[PDB]
Amino acid sequence: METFAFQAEIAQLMSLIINTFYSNKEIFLRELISNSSDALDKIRYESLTDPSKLDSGKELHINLIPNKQDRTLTIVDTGIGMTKADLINNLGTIAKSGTKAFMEALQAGADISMIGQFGVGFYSAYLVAEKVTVITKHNDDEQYAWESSAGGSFTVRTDTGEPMGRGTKVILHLKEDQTEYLEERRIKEIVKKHSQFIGYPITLFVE
Ligand SMILES: O=C(N[C@@H]1c2ccccc2-c2c(-c3cnc4ccccc4c3)cccc21)c1c(Br)cnc2[nH]cnc12
């Protein structure tokens, strides 16, 4: 397990999201399902030139898994996945410019709900989660676990868990006052309103 520091602005945005009074928190799901669809679009497109890219799994789907006992909501996809370089360096480059523009826009009057237009919709997870664990597997790298409770740092380690084949698991360890996102009725209602036309099957698991 390696520990990394976020740059001042990104830690400032994460703190903005984790704190700040904003009631419309449900938009986090739309954002993560959108990141999942983007990842599925990427692997599917890559496979068009190289079909061996789907040897790691052919099914292209999104699963939404609530767990009342662990107080978690997992968003699972079988997309492109992320390499160690992505988790540490490349996505850090994306998160830097995107944070700058979103912070500029927020000051100018833009809403927290517009986060996805700046390519940092992933951080909207912190509207409902006190900790986010990302389990991911790209064809070109090993299975990794990324994790942050915000607070200015994140960790990356090789993941010893169940092999995923290919894709991403975004585990949301929800805040104690955000357990409504564990209810079937609530998740269904959010999926219909914001994510009804995603081009991949979304299965809402139950308990
Ligand atoms: O959205 C995706 N990734 C996320 C994303 C988007 C934009 C900017 C950063 C990140 C990020 C970081 C991160 C965040 N901040 C950082 C800041 C500094 C350094 C490294 C950092 C790393 C860590 C884990 C996951 C993601 C994503 C991808 Br792609 C592929 N398949 C998926 N399926 C579902 N989601 C995804």
Curated annotation (Swiss-Prot):
Positions contributing to ATP binding: 35, 77, 96, 122
List of residues that carry N6-acetyllysine: 42, 68
Location of the region described as Interaction with NR3C1 in the Swiss-Prot/TrEMBL record: 2-207
Subcellular location: Nucleus; Cytoplasm; Melanosome; Cell membrane
Modification(s) after translation: ISGylated.
Entry function: Molecular chaperone that promotes the maturation, structural maintenance and proper regulation of specific target proteins involved for instance in cell cycle control and signal transduction. Undergoes a functional cycle that is linked to its ATPase activity which is essential for its chaperone activity. This cycle probably induces conformational changes in the client proteins, thereby causing their activation. Interacts dynamically with various co-chaperones that modulate its substrate recognition, ATPase cycle and chaperone function. (Microbial infection) Seems to interfere with N.meningitidis NadA-mediated invasion of human cells. Decreasing HSP90 levels increases adhesion and entry of E.coli expressing NadA into human Chang cells; increasing its levels leads to decreased adhesion and invasion.
Subunit organization: Homodimer. Identified in NR3C1/GCR steroid receptor-chaperone complexes formed at least by NR3C1, HSP90AA1 and a variety of proteins containing TPR repeats such as FKBP4, FKBP5, PPID, PPP5C or STIP1. Forms a complex containing HSP90AA1, TSC1 and TSC2; TSC1 is required to recruit TCS2 to the complex. The closed form interacts (via the middle domain and TPR repeat-binding motif) with co-chaperone TSC1 (via C-terminus). Interacts with TOM34. Interacts with TERT; the interaction, together with PTGES3, is required for correct assembly and stabilization of the TERT holoenzyme complex. (Microbial infection) Interacts with herpes simplex virus 1 protein US11; this interaction inhibits TBK1-induced interferon production.
Name of this protein: Heat shock protein HSP 90-alpha
Species, as recorded: Homo sapiens (Human)
Gene this protein is translated from: HSP90AA1
